Design a protein around this ligand. Sequence first.
Ligand SMILES: [Zn+2]
Ligand SMILES: [Zn+2]
Length: 371
Amino acid sequence: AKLVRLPGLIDVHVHLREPGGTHKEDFASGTAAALAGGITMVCAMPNTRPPIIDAPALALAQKLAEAGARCDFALFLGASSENAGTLGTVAGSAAGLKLYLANATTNSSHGVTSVVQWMEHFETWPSHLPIVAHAEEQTVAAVLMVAQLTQRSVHICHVARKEEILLIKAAKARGLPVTCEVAPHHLFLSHDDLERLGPGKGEVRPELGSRQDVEALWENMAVIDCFASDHAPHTLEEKCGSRPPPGFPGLETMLPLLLTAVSEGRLSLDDLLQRLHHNPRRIFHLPPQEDTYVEVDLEHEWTIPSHMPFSKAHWTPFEGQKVKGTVRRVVLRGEVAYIDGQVLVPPGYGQDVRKWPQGAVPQLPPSAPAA
Ligand SMILES: [Zn+2]
Ligand SMILES: [Zn+2]
């Protein structure tokens, strides 16, 4: 089985649960799963405990990741009910701003309850820096409206339904600056699989779609800018427990599933590289990684087991699905980081890419005229 060399892939939506939920995952275990999945750079989400919604929590998370991460990273800041206008000094050091717009009681929304709060953030957050929004169903149209009123771009996370992707398609057709990502469980899992998973294992936000939803995503792959795992590791105790948190662990399964689709002719290799490397780079202004690449074997057929080796979630919703292709070797900045069942760079090898000279988002100087 001869190998294919790819650049280092980028997963822009990962929940790594450190600080505060390290029994579900930490930086060291999460970045190990990332490397086993062909991913050499990740963007970790801010719904940590304490949440990353202030400069002190960001400084803490940044150094915990510098000491724990095995691959390179950037950290998101979280929009709060209170921090609009307070993040200007540290904004450039984050991956971007995350707005959580789920319509339910949860401390992932960090108090964001009102469209007026969204506007305050779109107006105070530096215009040259990225904003991503968790928005489901009609909320996507709402956030797009806020972006146009403030005349700036927005990135829509885990698009999962026909109505969402057709609305994004209409916005793009009118020249609006919007991009979006789709997660693997929304392209390969459906309502058909909720019987097997159950309401406990199968809870995820955005929830699994119907066959028509999944069908519309594949039909409109041209509208999708990025693939991202939405890696949301919860232990199986918590997924089956009383109040089950939403989220699937998918860092280790993302590439095997997509390479299977490439082997079946459902999308090209180029299409995959646009969505796991080039577009993540340009949307979040992520720098290249020197001497970094991934070798994959496209011929090895296998079945997804009950749990993948490296995530502490210790379960996967893709169990039993047959996949073609495997990650064989990852080289990260000159060093062998992974080979065929074992990660070989220690915790702390990863670096914060926003501290690289090439990793800052370019901006006009302060003394530039108003225009
Ligand atoms: Zn989300
Ligand atoms: Zn998420």
